[PDB]
Amino acid sequence: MIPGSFDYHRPKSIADAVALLTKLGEDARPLAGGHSLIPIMKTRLATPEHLVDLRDIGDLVGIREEGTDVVIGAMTTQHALIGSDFLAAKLPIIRETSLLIADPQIRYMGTIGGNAANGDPGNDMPALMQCLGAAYELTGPEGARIVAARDYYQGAYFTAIEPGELLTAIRIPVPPTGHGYAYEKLKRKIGDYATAAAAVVLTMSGGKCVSASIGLTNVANTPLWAEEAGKVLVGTALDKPALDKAVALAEAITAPASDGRGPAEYRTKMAGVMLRRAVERAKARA
Amino acid sequence: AEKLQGMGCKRKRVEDIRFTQGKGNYVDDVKLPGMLFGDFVRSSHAHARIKSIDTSKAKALPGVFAVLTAADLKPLNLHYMPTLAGDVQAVLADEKVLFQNQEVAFVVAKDRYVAADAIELVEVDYEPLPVLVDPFKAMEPDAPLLREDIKDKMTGAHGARKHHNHIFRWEIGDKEGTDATFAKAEVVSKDMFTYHRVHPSPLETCQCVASMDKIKGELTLWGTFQAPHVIRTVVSLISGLPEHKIHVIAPDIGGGFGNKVGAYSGYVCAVVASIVLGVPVKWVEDRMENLSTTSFARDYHMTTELAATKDGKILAMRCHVLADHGAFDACADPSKWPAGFMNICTGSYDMPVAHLAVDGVYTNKASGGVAYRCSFRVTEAVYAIERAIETLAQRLEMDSADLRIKNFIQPEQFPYMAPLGWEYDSGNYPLAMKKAMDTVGYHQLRAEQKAKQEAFKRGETREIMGIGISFFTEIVGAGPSKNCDILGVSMFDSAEIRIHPTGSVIARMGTKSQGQGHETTYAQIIATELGIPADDIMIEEGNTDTAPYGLGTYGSRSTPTAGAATAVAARKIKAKAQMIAAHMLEVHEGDLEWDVDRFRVKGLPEKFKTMKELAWASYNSPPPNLEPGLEAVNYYDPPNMTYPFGAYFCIMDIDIDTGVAKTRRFYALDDCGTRINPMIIEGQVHGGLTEAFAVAMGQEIRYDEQGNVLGASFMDFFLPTAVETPKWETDYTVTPSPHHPIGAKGVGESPHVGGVPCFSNAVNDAYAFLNAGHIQMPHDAWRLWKVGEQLGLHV
Amino acid sequence: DSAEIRIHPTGSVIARMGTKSQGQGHETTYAQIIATELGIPADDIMIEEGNTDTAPYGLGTYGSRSTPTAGAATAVAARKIKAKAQMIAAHMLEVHEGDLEWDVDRFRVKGLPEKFKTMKELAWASYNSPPPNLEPGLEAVNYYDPPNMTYP
Amino acid sequence: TVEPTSAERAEKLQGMGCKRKRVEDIRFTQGKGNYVDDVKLPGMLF
Amino acid sequence: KAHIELTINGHPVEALVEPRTLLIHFIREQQNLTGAHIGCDTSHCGACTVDLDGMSVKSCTMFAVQANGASITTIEGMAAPDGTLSALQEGFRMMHGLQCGYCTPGMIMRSHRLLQENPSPTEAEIRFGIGGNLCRCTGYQNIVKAIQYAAAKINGVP
Amino acid sequence: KAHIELTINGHPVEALVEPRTLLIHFIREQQNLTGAHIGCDTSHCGACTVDLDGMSVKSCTMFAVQANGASITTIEGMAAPDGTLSALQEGFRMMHGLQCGYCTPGMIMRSHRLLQENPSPTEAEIRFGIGGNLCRCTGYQNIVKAIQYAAAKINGVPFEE
Numbered sequence A: 001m002i003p004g005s006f007d008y009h010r011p012k013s014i015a016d017a018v019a020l021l022t023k024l025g026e027d028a029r030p031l032a033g034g035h036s037l038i039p040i041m042k043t044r045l046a047t048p049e050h051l052v053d054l055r056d057i058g059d060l061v062g063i064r065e066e067g068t069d070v071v072i073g074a075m076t077t078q079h080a081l082i083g084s085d086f087l088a089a090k091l092p093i094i095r096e097t098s099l100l101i102a103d104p105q106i107r108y109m110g111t112i113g114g115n116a117a118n119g120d121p122g123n124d125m126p127a128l129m130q131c132l133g134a135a136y137e138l139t140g141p142e143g144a145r146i147v148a149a150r151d152y153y154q155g156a157y158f159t160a161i162e163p164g165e166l167l168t169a170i171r172i173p174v175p176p177t178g179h180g181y182a183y184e185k186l187k188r189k190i191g192d193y194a195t196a197a198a199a200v201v202l203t204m205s206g207g208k209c210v211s212a213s214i215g216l217t218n219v220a221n222t223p224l225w226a227e228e229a230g231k232v233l234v235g236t237a238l239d240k241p242a243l244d245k246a247v248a249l250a251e252a253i254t255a256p257a258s259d260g261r262g263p264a265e266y267r268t269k270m271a272g273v274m275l276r277r278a279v280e281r282a283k284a285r286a
Numbered sequence B: 001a002e003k004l005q006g007m008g009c010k011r012k013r014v015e016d017i018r019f020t021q022g023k024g025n026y027v028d029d030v031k032l033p034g035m036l037f038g039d040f041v042r043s044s045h046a047h048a049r050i051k052s053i054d055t056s057k058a059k060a061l062p063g064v065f066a067v068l069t070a071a072d073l074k075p076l077n078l079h080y081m082p083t084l085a086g087d088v089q090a091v092l093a094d095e096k097v098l099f100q101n102q103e104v105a106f107v108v109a110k111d112r113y114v115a116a117d118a119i120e121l122v123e124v125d126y127e128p129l130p131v132l133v134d135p136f137k138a139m140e141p142d143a144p145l146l147r148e149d150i151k152d153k154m155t156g157a158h159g160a161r162k163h164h165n166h167i168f169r170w171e172i173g174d175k176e177g178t179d180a181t182f183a184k185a186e187v188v189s190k191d192m193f194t195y196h197r198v199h200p201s202p203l204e205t206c207q208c209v210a211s212m213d214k215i216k217g218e219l220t221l222w223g224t225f226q227a228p229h230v231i232r233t234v235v236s237l238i239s240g241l242p243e244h245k246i247h248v249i250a251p252d253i254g255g256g257f258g259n260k261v262g263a264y265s266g267y268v269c270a271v272v273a274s275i276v277l278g279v280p281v282k283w284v285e286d287r288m289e290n291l292s293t294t295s296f297a298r299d300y301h302m303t304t305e306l307a308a309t310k311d312g313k314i315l316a317m318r319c320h321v322l323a324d325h326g327a328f329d330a331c332a333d334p335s336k337w338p339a340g341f342m343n344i345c346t347g348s349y350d351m352p353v354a355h356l357a358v359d360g361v362y363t364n365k366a367s368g369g370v371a372y373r374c375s376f377r378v379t380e381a382v383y384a385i386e387r388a389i390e391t392l393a394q395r396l397e398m399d400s401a402d403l404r405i406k407n408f409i410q411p412e413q414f415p416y417m418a419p420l421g422w423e424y425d426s427g428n429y430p431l432a433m434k435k436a437m438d439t440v441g442y443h444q445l446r447a448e449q450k451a452k453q454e455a456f457k458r459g460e461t462r463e464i465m466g467i468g469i470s471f472f473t474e475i476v477g478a479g480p481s482k483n484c485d486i487l488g489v490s491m492f493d494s495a496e497i498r499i500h501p502t503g504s505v506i507a508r509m510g511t512k513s514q515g516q517g518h519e520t521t522y523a524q525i526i527a528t529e530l531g532i533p534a535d536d537i538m539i540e541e542g543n544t545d546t547a548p549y550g551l552g553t554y555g556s557r558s559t560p561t562a563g564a565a566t567a568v569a570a571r572k573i574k575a576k577a578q579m580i581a582a583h584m585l586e587v588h589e590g591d592l593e594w595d596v597d598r599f600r601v602k603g604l605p606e607k608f609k610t611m612k613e614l615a616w617a618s619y620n621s622p623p624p625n626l627e628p629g630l631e632a633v634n635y636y637d638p639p640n641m642t643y644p645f646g647a648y649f650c651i652m653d654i655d656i657d658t659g660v661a662k663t664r665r666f667y668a669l670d671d672c673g674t675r676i677n678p679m680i681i682e683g684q685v686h687g688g689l690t691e692a693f694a695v696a697m698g699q700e701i702r703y704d705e706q707g708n709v710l711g712a713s714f715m716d717f718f719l720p721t722a723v724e725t726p727k728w729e730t731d732y733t734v735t736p737s738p739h740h741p742i743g744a745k746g747v748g749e750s751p752h753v754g755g756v757p758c759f760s761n762a763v764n765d766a767y768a769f770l771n772a773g774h775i776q777m778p779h780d781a782w783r784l785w786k787v788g789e790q791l792g793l794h795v
Numbered sequence C: 001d002s003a004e005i006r007i008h009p010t011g012s013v014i015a016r017m018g019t020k021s022q023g024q025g026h027e028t029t030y031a032q033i034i035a036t037e038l039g040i041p042a043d044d045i046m047i048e049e050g051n052t053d054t055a056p057y058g059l060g061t062y063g064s065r066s067t068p069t070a071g072a073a074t075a076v077a078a079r080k081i082k083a084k085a086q087m088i089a090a091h092m093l094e095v096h097e098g099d100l101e102w103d104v105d106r107f108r109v110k111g112l113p114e115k116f117k118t119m120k121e122l123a124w125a126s127y128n129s130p131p132p133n134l135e136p137g138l139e140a141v142n143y144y145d146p147p148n149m150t151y152p
Numbered sequence D: 001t002v003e004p005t006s007a008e009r010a011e012k013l014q015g016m017g018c019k020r021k022r023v024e025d026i027r028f029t030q031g032k033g034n035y036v037d038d039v040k041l042p043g044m045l046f
Numbered sequence E: 001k002a003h004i005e006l007t008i009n010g011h012p013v014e015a016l017v018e019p020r021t022l023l024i025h026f027i028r029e030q031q032n033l034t035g036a037h038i039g040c041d042t043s044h045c046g047a048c049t050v051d052l053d054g055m056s057v058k059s060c061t062m063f064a065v066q067a068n069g070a071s072i073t074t075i076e077g078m079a080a081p082d083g084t085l086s087a088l089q090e091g092f093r094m095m096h097g098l099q100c101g102y103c104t105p106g107m108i109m110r111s112h113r114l115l116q117e118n119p120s121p122t123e124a125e126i127r128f129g130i131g132g133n134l135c136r137c138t139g140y141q142n143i144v145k146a147i148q149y150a151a152a153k154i155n156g157v158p
Numbered sequence F: 001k002a003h004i005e006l007t008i009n010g011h012p013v014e015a016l017v018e019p020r021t022l023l024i025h026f027i028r029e030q031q032n033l034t035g036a037h038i039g040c041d042t043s044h045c046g047a048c049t050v051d052l053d054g055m056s057v058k059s060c061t062m063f064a065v066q067a068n069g070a071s072i073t074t075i076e077g078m079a080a081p082d083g084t085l086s087a088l089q090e091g092f093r094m095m096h097g098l099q100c101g102y103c104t105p106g107m108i109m110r111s112h113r114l115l116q117e118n119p120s121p122t123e124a125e126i127r128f129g130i131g132g133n134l135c136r137c138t139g140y141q142n143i144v145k146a147i148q149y150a151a152a153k154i155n156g157v158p159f160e161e
């Protein structure tokens, strides 16, 4: 319950935050909504010497459409995501996913950037961002760069971010109007990380699937983009034969942990069932 | 009339005024001059010898005032403390640790932040020993010797002493007659039902503030105690301090649910630390320590058997229990009942004979057993018989509702002497079972279920429907002095009532509420007895200097014991008021009759004296033959327990492909005799059914092969939120306890006792048409998925 | 005035009165009365006055009335406890109450002094093994209405 | 003195008639008596 | 230590705190506002919930320094200046929405914000709306009734 | 407010006080050492007596600022760390030198200095020596006996009966 002591900083700009993180080093950690970092500081699994609170940086909060993308500031909260009718018009899957994350109090504080930068395979936004083909904008001492969400995760708490960098925004391509979407989550209770969850976006034309993309949550040490699974659905009527093939290809890439949510084999099977249900709801919406 | 609010009324709670405004007074709200904070360095190992403990870095940290180890306690003979089960538990590990998170050293610092820092600085060197976590192997020849302090390597069961890991063997019933019935019965139904380890998990953890006043030589101890007087007496016996100089105070407690009956190392260490330092010492545990080191509940492996005729008449019950008590036997229980009242396991049925045997064993786990609305192992007893009724019914190809009806103890048979020794006080089971069945449309549900099963067989649905039934007989109100005592103190309870000159009242009892509404309900009992408005009565519990001695609140004993004492004490006051009325009215007491709030002269109703006038007269014009004042005390030793009962029905739908179960309807009929406050009873039922739902569907505390305690935090421990908790439908019948002063039986634990078997029977019933056999709890999604997986439902 | 005396399981005592000392030593002297009446050392008795929620109702301290009133109530209340303790002793020793005699802090069987129960043993027994016809515990209250004043 | 005489037991009582030393003196001689002006409560005015 | 200034229950507060001090401890231990409670060490129970800058926040999962400049309302700040109970406090009492009272301050603080987010919530919206608050005593049924009762009282004030 | 630093009962003390704050209130109200008492408003009773820089002083007749840098002993500082009472505290109990206890802290603090001024005083010297301390309960006779007891204890030999 009691964290180790640390020094606290309140940079006024991204530039200042980055300089501070670069100077301070590995012992400094950015502090966003604090709803993953403080809990692990309280168990002392994390014992940073410095916390760099991003609270005062206004440029990190916001939702806008730019070209063919929606750009979301890293400090935008889950509550803000749910409240955005503009976002619900363009990317309705985000509100649906966000409503399945944690609880009201945690959603008032937790940010999309923190959810994506955490590296906990339990987080729901990572695989959703992979499904959507989102890009993460990073700013470090060496400048700005972009890393695809699909290439950002390597393991538990292991990501592509480099020392001194801050994830400043998430750029999400806007799916065709009328597209189908769904985030289907299986959990033990409100607030629990998924036993297995699937994110699906797809488009239809003349009764056949034109495009399909699938993300799988918490069924490996990282989120997973089920590339083969989505590919097999394209060109099909999204009937049982097609779904069976997609389920096989998705299950094939899972490697779940065996924990309180059940053994690996159960979670692999559930990734498949959540995928079927998500495709079904997405199909109906398309 | 509007102001009385006596028995039967849905009186709103007086406790709510302060609680809704943050003005309750719980242990951690206490702040005293010079108060320090203490907490434990705990064991990372389940079983190991302690080679060395270096506390030098911790003691050197600024803000640290002391670091206690077993080395410090021995000289006071305090490194071990006695338990309610008659065993001892280590306060601070001496030569070895026996369970993960066991207390090793107690750090005392200026505040809880510095204490946490210091705990990290203590270094413990461990020498690993083989871990024992499977109770079924605890008594094998080569099983690890855990309790080196009291046992000697005894690898058998035919020596001068049991087995080094055997705690006790307790049996009751007619063994020869039971065995003979099973040897000839047409049908024998046997299953091994495991009631898995869970935990009471009150929202407020265990804690205390010890303050030894060295100038006065008096100890004041604030704490989360369900039995404050017992704690005072125990503290006196082990500390040498006399009881009149130990002031125990149980203030507002944020739920107990059995977790706060016993003493914990934290209480002893805070007291020793305060005595040593001369300043107050507060100890407050975090949730992970609460769930992994304080009283667990259940962990009974029950080989249960019923003998019957082909037509469904039950002839005998035979049950053997393997009880996992953890490393120390700290299982709360009256001293002569090592398995509590598990002998109430023949339940609501009239059986000729039965036999019960229980073996308790030690394992490398936290202690406990009796907690979480168990009524002293009645949760286990009811689960055993209600599950056995269902498996016998399946074997007989008979509807289980009809099997129960054919075997119910009938109304006319009460008081009924059951085959394992308990005499039930009153009960009308057929009427309650019929009301329940008619309310839920039982036979219609069975028809619906049959059609849904056929639809499943045709591939038309992936959902199965289960109907769970639990008809139970509880036994609460632990108190006959003949066989019920807590470490030698008879299990009575008490009430003291004092009426002031102007008519208001101060009344105290020997029990201790942790949310059950006593401060509201005891006043209702007095209000009806004396005709004094409930709001003119102040109720207090928990301060041992002021409340009459009692045995505390657990075993749903408050209404049976202190509730009875409250009525008897009020009646003593009523009797004295009648003498005062006779003196004032100049008539014989025989010429008076009580009428709601006054005594009237028979025949001359115009001549009367109200309780208020009599209270004033007792101070202003006391009759010469009587003492002034108007107050009384009663220590009530109950003649028998009270036996409330219930009929619970659950309709559950299960998705066989994910294992996800969803309660469709839950109906709970409870009969606890005279109902003091229907509103409060309803709240108790809602809470208890929610715990039952949690226990049956997901709650658990586990240990792996290495002794690691698993799931002991809210990250995994299933506490339902408002989203998962089913809506509850409640009903009742009223069958008064003939021996109780107001006919009221206890009821607090009934919902949990009857609810778990109800939920588990619904899950088991859903899969019965697929021949799943007995499915062990908890019934969470991955486990029900495995049931379906093993039945071939997923291919 | 009044007195309430409660004996704990282990033999110590909490007693309160309706008077209120302002230096007259009541916390010391009321315990001396109880000590002699019950055979319980004065140091094992805690005396309190002044808190209206806990002390029995009394009229206070003035008119040198404490000893005449609450002092009397203390003796009478203690005597009620002694009478109950005598009943417990007869039950335990299996003799008639009339066969018992008091010897400072214990009841002995007349002519057989080796058969006895001390007040401390009786206090424990009142909680541990209450005779069937008696209530558990050992305590008493007395509100004393004096028959006359005292004239020192 | 394991089985003290009647006289010894009566003497230990420090009962009626004895010059028993005062229990109040322990706190009073140490400034630990609790008189009204010693009382301090949150928000207390004068 | 860091110097912080904020408003709690409408009153200016200034203090020096270690950055690691959790807001729940600052509120309970330094400000003596002991209504807020601690029921867990993993951020699940919500017994520590306070209203902070228009949001329901679990104060055991925030450092006091993060709240510098914030406006906080705790259970002690719900009653009206004249002592009258808020609709929620009254509703919890009338509908028997509490027993031990330990989750109550957090439940009422969350509900206060819930009824501002949605003045007329359905039962499903209420249950989901208090998903971050655990109660061991009530089984939640009467808490739903308490919130519905409060919404009806509030909706009658205008 | 003025900043003062001193030593009370052997411990360093640092505080802020208004100049007009009487030492008796600084001790009782700010340091919570409530043994010292107030029995009058004219400096006659001595119930507020503390030992300050080797002098018996009526703290109701001095401002806290005047004691900046001083060493003060109050009744709370008389008992030994091992809990054993001082000779004077024991003597007051043994000889029944107090009843309501109100003048006691000041009486013992004055006596503490008196026995340092004169380790073996006669009865007349004791009565004159505590002339600045009023008692309403005892009639002084047992107080004189208590002081004689303490002196004999300290000296290891009695003087007057």
Ligand SMILES: Cc1cc2nc3c(=O)[nH]c(=O)nc-3n(C[C@H](O)[C@H](O)[C@H](O)COP(=O)(O)OP(=O)(O)OC[C@H]3O[C@@H](n4cnc5c(N)ncnc54)[C@H](O)[C@@H]3O)c2cc1C
Pocket: A029, A030, A031, A032, A033, A034, A035, A036, A037, A038, A039, A074, A075, A100, A101, A102, A103, A106, A109, A110, A111, A112, A113, A114, A115, A117, A118, A122, A123, A124, A125, A161, A165, A166, A167, A168, A191, A192, A193, A194, E042, E043, E044
């Ligand atoms: C009880 C509970 C239940 C939960 N349930 C869920 C759930 O169901 N699904 C889910 O998705 N989440 C869940 N969470 C986690 C929650 O969504 C967190 O808010 C999220 O994981 C982290 O976002 P944050 O803003 O709080 O970040 P923080 O905790 O502040 O930080 C998380 C990590 O990311 C780093 N970081 C944060 N922002 C940046 C940035 N801009 N650039 C680089 N590094 C950064 C921090 O340094 C730290 O290492 C739960 C949390 C709790 C307490």
Ligand SMILES: Nc1ccn([C@@H]2O[C@H](COP(=O)(O)OP(=O)(O)OC[C@H]3Oc4nc5nc(N)nc(O)c5nc4C(S)=C3S)[C@@H](O)[C@H]2O)c(=O)n1
Pocket: B255, B256, B257, B258, B371, B372, B373, B374, B375, B514, B515, B516, B517, B518, B521, B522, B553, B554, B555, B556, B557, B558, B559, B560, B672, B673, B674, B675, B676, B677, B678, B680, B681, B684, B687, B744, B745, B746, B747, B748, B749, E099, E100, E137
């Ligand atoms: N015939 C009856 C019986 C009971 N009642 C009311 O219901 C309440 C519970 O009374 P009772 O059944 O006698 O049970 P106890 O008061 O002895 O409670 C103990 C029981 O209480 C249970 N419910 C709990 N509820 C809360 N809020 N907190 C706990 O810790 C609880 N612990 C559990 C456990 S475990 C136990 S053992 C009391 O206000 C009583 O007046 C009534 O109106 N009529």
Ligand code: FES
Pocket: E037, E038, E039, E040, E041, E042, E043, E044, E045, E046, E047, E048, E049, E058, E059, E060, E061
């Ligand atoms: S104390 Fe449990 S969420 Fe804050």
Ligand code: FES
Pocket: B203, B254, B255, B515, E097, E098, E099, E100, E101, E102, E103, E104, E134, E135, E136, E137, E138
């Ligand atoms: S009222 Fe007890 S936890 Fe909710």
Ligand code: FES
Pocket: F037, F038, F039, F040, F041, F042, F043, F044, F045, F046, F047, F048, F049, F058, F059, F060, F061
């Ligand atoms: S108070 Fe009387 S001399 Fe100081």
Ligand code: FES
Pocket: C023, F097, F098, F099, F100, F101, F102, F103, F104, F134, F135, F136, F137, F138
């Ligand atoms: S003892 Fe009372 S004034 Fe001296």
Ligand SMILES: [Cu+2]
Pocket: B258, B371, B372, B373, B374, B375, B376, B377, B554, B555, B556, B749
């Ligand atoms: Cu129980």
